[PDB]
Design a protein around this ligand. Structure first.
Ligand SMILES: [Cl-]
Ligand SMILES: [Cl-]
Ligand SMILES: [Cl-]
Length: 163
């Protein structure tokens, strides 16, 4: 584990991360997709062999020796708010189990269900709080990746508030 486990946020493409493994914001069918998923497919295409997994789960596939944890958040256009909330929390709990199993000291993670699976709603606080609930008990350094300047500031404020 990291000597003093931390959370950090960076506003850049997760495909350029400086961590020991990456979490993909995957679709259930293991398709190239859009947004984070498409960037992950371009950088680590080998990790999409048998990466299909149900909503609310995570499945890791190696690209060489680099782990890609495919985490499937719910698409809020299809799920009710109640059921989608439960599946989003579940996907993050599965990411925490995979990060622990892998023994990594750091992990790059996006905010699940905040892009095209958001159902047109701002889910920064919802998704980030489920990320914290799952990852707080792990000892890996977590680096959250985002692309919006206002989201970077809000994620950074939420991290600093708890220290
Ligand atoms: Cl970039
Ligand atoms: Cl998304
Ligand atoms: Cl963003």
């Amino acid at each position: 584990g990291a000597m003093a486990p931390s959370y950090r946020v960076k506003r850049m493409d997760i495909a350029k991360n400086d961590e020991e493994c990456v979490v993909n914001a995957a679709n259930p069918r293991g398709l190239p997709g859009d947004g984070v998923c498409k960037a992950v497919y371009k950088k680590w295409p080998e990790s999409f062999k048998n990466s299909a997994t149900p909503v609310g789960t995570a499945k890791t596939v190696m690209c060489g020796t680099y782990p890609v944890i495919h985490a499937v958040g719910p698409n809020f256009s299809n799920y009710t708010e109640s059921e989608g909330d439960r599946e989003l929390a579940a996907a993050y709990r599965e990411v925490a189990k995979e990060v622990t199993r892998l023994g990594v000291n750091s992990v790059a993670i996006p905010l699940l269900s905040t892009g095209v699976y958001s159902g047109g709603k701002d889910r920064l606080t919802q998704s980030l709080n489920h990320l914290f609930t799952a990852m707080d008990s792990t000892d890996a350094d977590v680096v959250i990746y985002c692309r919006d300047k206002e989201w970077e500031k809000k994620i950074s404020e939420a991290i600093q508030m708890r220290t």
